[PDB]
């Protein structure tokens with residue numbers, strides 16, 4: 001379980017999660033070696049939580065935990081996870097014309113992993129394309145559990161103190177700072193919107209929501225976003241997104257949380273929709 005700093009040579013950075021950098025290391029005990037993703041602390045309370053969460057989770061659509069490397073440089077542990085060089089769907093989809101059936105297999109896979117995460121009484125709180133990694137052409141894994149919390153209750157009371165991804169968030173999260181299982185389903189709807197736009201930047205939630213709100217009064221982007229969503233306005237139907245999928249997307253974006261489907265509801269619908277366009 002314990003990786004040694006001795007045989008752990010840094011190759012490059014992969015990116016920034018919620019607490020500190022994700023980096024590529026070759027772990028070569030032989031000195032002639034397994035390649036691993038290492039998340040590090042640059043906060044200290046939330047970081048300890050990501051370690052304890054991912055150490056509990058085992059699923060084919062959750063990023064593989066490997067171990068903890070006792071990092072003398074930050075007086076803490078680094079999280080060591082499997083390396084997947086294809087990276088995030090936000091990285092991959094803009095440069096690979098993936099067909100509709102494959103995108104729905106990805107969406108089925110996210111729901112299976114999220115169904116598992118809910119079953120273990122955890123919310124994700126940043127289910128976005130940027131946090132879904134591609135292991136291969138037809139397998140995705142959820143990463144970044146930096147904002148994930150244990151539900152005690154049907155929701156966690158979040159704070160304003162935090163790097164909140166407001167463009168992926170349900171009205172109840174934005175207004176009443178309550179995060180329900182049903183709030184992760186709304187985030188899934190936005191993620192599904194990202195998949196069907198091949199995570200095109202010009203088509204992104206922040207781009208499209210600020211296109212509706214504007215930038216003239218930035219101190220109420222949230223208030224304007226909350227009102228826009230309560231008046232029933234939604235991100236548009238992506239080019240070549242089937243009517244049926246957009247309806248499922250809108251069902252995930254139900255203003256009332258109790259009217260959104262659970263992930264266990266979505267799985268057989270996405271299974272069946274996948275089969276059709278295949």
Ligand SMILES: CCNC(=O)c1ccc(Nc2cc(-c3c(F)cccc3Cl)nc3c2C(=O)N=C3)nc1
Nearest residue numbers: 014015016017022037083084085087091131143144
């Ligand atoms: C710009 C090109 N992008 C890549 O070349 C690339 C390839 C693989 C990659 N892998 C990531 C990326 C993350 C990660 C991150 F760095 C920032 C935010 C969210 C996530 Cl899920 N986490 C893990 C991994 C990984 O292999 N194991 C864990 N990251 C980037």
